Structures are given as structure tokens and as C-alpha cells.
Amino acid sequence: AQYEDGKQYTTLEKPVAGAPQVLEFFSFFCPHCYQFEEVLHISDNVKKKLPEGVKMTKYHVNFMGGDLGKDLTQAWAVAMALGVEDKVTVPLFEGVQKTQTIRSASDIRDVFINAGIKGEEYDAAWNSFVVKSLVAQQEKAAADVQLRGVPAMFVNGKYQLNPQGMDTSNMDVFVQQYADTVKYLSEK
Numbered sequence: 307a308q309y310e311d312g313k314q315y316t317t318l319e320k321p322v323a324g325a326p327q328v329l330e331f332f333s334f335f336c337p338h339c340y341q342f343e344e345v346l347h348i349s350d351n352v353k354k355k356l357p358e359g360v361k362m363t364k365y366h367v368n369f370m371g372g373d374l375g376k377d378l379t380q381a382w383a384v385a386m387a388l389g390v391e392d393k394v395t396v397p398l399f400e401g402v403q404k405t406q407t408i409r410s411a412s413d414i415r416d417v418f419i420n421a422g423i424k425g426e427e428y429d430a431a432w433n434s435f436v437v438k439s440l441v442a443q444q445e446k447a448a449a450d451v452q453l454r455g456v457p458a459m460f461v462n463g464k465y466q467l468n469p470q471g472m473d474t475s476n477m478d479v480f481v482q483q484y485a486d487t488v489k490y491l492s493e494k
Contacts, residue, residue, distance in 0.1 A: 313471040314487040325463025326363035334402045335370035351485040365444040377411040383440035384431045393421045461491035
């Protein structure tokens with residue numbers, strides 16, 4: 307058929323109860339994640355095709371970058387808690403991978419301050435238990451899909467996107483196929 311298990315997607319042996327409808331994992335240290343987000347715009351192309359009432363969730367991972375990697379997962383929790391993901395995603399990626407001006411937790415915080423988040427507001431969130439629970443949620447989600455690498459995307463806790471089984475191509479047909487596959491999976 308057009309969409310096939312083992313081709314554009316695979317099926318989790320252990321489906322995840324209560325999982326987000328569309329769940330993406332990434333790291334700000336991850337070179338292909340930079341490409342996915344800043345060049346291919348995978349997240350945004352997926353959203354433009356998602357059915358009504360389907361939300362996208364995006365989580366950061368710890369296993370790249372050591373201490374700074376964990377700081378970035380905690381900062382991503384802060385972004386989620388404050389609802390400023392669309393203000394910090396580009397400067398965090400560029401800070402880590404383009405300019406390489408993000409080397410410490412303070413450097414991460416600078417991105418938020420420069421983006422207009424008040425210092426008080428960032429620090430209260432950073433130190434909050436709401437943020438510690440959001441870090442834990444991100445780690446738990448990774449365990450639940452038995453995550454091995456990033457970038458990665460899962461639909462309804464049952465299906466895993468398999469870009470390896472899609473076209474190389476014009477980047478753009480790849481992106482289109484990826485977004486079309488997510489939409490098919492969401493309706494499955």
C-alpha cells in the first residue's frame with residue numbers, strides 16, 4: 307500500500323498509555339535536529355497538516371552534551387512552563403550550534419533575557435517544582451518509547467516515524483512525506 311509498517315513508520319511493541327497525540331524528541335546539541343527544525347521546519351510542517359483537535363508535544367533529551375545537555379532540558383521545561391517555545395527555539399539552536407556562544411546555564415538564561423523574559427520570571431521557573439516535574443515528564447516519555455536517538459517522533463504512543471524509509475530527494479518532498487505520514491498516523 308501507500309503507507310506501510312516498516313517503511314514510513316514502525317509500530318511500537320509496547321504502546322504507551324496516555325501518550326501525547328504527536329510527540330517529538332530533540333536536543334539543541336543534535337546536528338540533525340538543527341536541520342529538522344531550522345532548515346526543514348519539520349515541526350511546523352507537521353502542524354499545518356494535523357487534524358483539528360490534535361496537539362503537538364515537543365520534548366528535549368539529556369543524553370547529548372553532558373551537564374549542558376541537562377541544563378538545556380531544564381531550560382526547555384522553563385520554555386514550556388512559560389509558553390515561550392516560539393521565542394527561544396531559534397536562538398537556543400543558534401547559540402548552541404551556530405555561534406557556539408552557549409556554554410553554560412547562564413548563557414542559556416541570557417537567551418531568555420534577550421528574548422524579553424524577565425530575570426525574576428526565568429529564575430522562579432528554573433527553580434520551580436513545576437519545572438522539575440516537566441523535566442521528569444520529558445525523561446519518562448523517553449523511557450516509555452524506549453528512545454535510542456534524536457530526532458524522533460511518535461504518534462498516539464503507538465507509531466514511530468521512520469524517515470529512513472522516506473525519500474532523500476528534494477528536502478521538500480521528504481518534508482512533505484514526513485508531514486503526510488504523521489497526518490495518516492494520527493487518523494489511524
